Amino acid sequence: PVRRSEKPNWDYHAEIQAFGHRLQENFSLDLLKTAFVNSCYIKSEEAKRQQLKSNQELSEQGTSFSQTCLTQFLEDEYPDMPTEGIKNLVDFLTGEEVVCHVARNLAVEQLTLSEEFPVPPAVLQQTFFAVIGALLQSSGPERTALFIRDFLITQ
Amino acid sequence: IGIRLTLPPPKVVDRWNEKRAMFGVYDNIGILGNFEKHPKELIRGPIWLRGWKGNELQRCIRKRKMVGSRMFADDLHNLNKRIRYLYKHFNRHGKFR
């Protein structure tokens, strides 16, 4: 298996825009691009070129928001639940496997720039949170909260 | 098994060889040329077949009477036998009377 970028009938620009439009989200396209470019990729790219910004900021913001957002939802829905309980429940929702499942079927991996194909789940998860972070900068807390609800809560 | 296991050599057909280019020229020899010749005078081939058409039986009758003398002993015996066969087939056999 080789990445879909390395396959006929591919233009990343048009695909990026369609990723925005699929989810009915008015993304800032510049930021979304920045969300999909991993640090591992840039190291490999530099080494390859020998013979651009990281996801870091966007990814951290995405994860921190989703954690707080998910706790808010869960505390409001299930008030009798303890703190430790909802901790584990959010941790499940922000889990490697489940978030990567969502990522896989939202074609996140298709637009993800990584050194290794198929994509390691750590990277894919990091990329998915970058998407959320970019969306957060794009359309404020409200729209993003709706996105979390529509994707993560459904799991 | 009985199906080829590779593609045959590609066939290229030259559509613009002289024979293809001047195909069917002088078919209008009659109407365009004062009726000096019929187009049937462009037909080449057997003596018994130039500008005439018939079923197998009729073709055989005709070949017998036109080149019957000049043909080979065994060929002619084959032709006499053909005619005998076809005569019975057409006159005595079939669905409709």
């Binding site: 233009d11 048009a14 825009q17 369609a18 439009h21 | -």
Partner: protein
């Protein structure tokens, strides 16, 4: 040999007065009212008129449409139609494309 010329044609703004000039040349200075009604039954004058228009405008009436040029109005109405000449790739590429659509060309 001269280079092959484009089949593209845009009708000019002063077509009316240019045709005025050409008709008054060929049919003579004296011109009756409603000059659009002038018949091109005469073979020689038809040729002369159409030649002048063909040489300057660059666009010629084809063999197919020649018998349709019965009257002078018919010539005027013929030259006001534009011809734009480009391959179908070129016409589609600049045809208000949605950004999701992509067309490529392997000829």
């Amino acid at each position: 040999c001269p280079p092959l010329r484009s089949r593209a044609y845009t009708p000019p703004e002063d077509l009316q007065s240019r045709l005025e000039s050409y008709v008054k040349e060929v049919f003579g200075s004296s011109l009756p009212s409603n000059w659009q009604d002038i018949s091109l039954e005469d073979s020689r004058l038809k040729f002369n008129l159409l030649a002048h228009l063909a040489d300057d405008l660059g666009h010629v009436v084809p063999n197919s449409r020649l018998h349709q040029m019965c009257r002078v109005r018919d010539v005027l109405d013929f030259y006001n139609v534009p011809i734009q000449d480009r391959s179908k790739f070129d016409e589609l590429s600049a045809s208000n494309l949605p950004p999701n659509l992509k067309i490529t060309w392997s000829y």
